[PDB]
A paper describes a structure:
Bromo and extra-terminal (BET) proteins provide a recruitment platform initiated by the recognition of acetylated lysines (Kac) by their tandem bromodomains (BRD, Dhalluin et al., 1999, Jacobson et al., 2000, Owen et al., 2000). BETs, like all of the 42 human BRD-containing proteins, contain additional interaction domains that recruit other proteins to the acetylated protein target, forming complex assemblies and contributing to processes such as chromatin remodeling and transcription. Direct targeting of BET-BRDs by small-molecule inhibitors such as the high-affinity and pan-BET specificity thienodiazepine (+)-JQ1 (hereafter referred to as JQ1) enables their displacement from Kac. Multiple decreased interactors harbor sequences that can directly associate with BET-BRDs in canonical or new BRD-mediated structural binding modes, and we propose that the tandem BRDs present in each BET protein may be capable of simultaneously recruiting both a histone and a second interactor.
Residue numbers in the entry:
A (entry chain B): 310 to 319
B (entry chain A): 43 to 167
Amino acid sequence: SGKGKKKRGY
Amino acid sequence: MNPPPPETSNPNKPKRQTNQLQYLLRVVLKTLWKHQFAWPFQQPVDAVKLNLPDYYKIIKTPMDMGTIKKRLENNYYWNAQECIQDFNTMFTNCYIYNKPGDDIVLMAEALEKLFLQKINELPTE
């Protein structure tokens, strides 16, 4: 139901 | 399944260059595109890859920055507001699908703040 935790890009 | 992505070129549409449209590509899109939170918004949401089986039950107007970029580049938009509407749709899609406080939502909120700062200086119509 969600996309989860995200890392940032550069 | 995912739907086909939104259309990005139509050779039968009339074409115009305007300061507003140029600014939307060269300042607004470019600034958001390069941001460290941009990557989840640079292409259509792939609900198959991301295992979001309910995504299109609520997201009936998908939008993303890859599509907006291509639309600008192909003179798909006539009125500046068409492009602004697409950015806004991208944000509001995120807020109706994803739980408040999820990382994607906090990323979209930061991008939307930046969008509003750049749109503030849009050229006049």
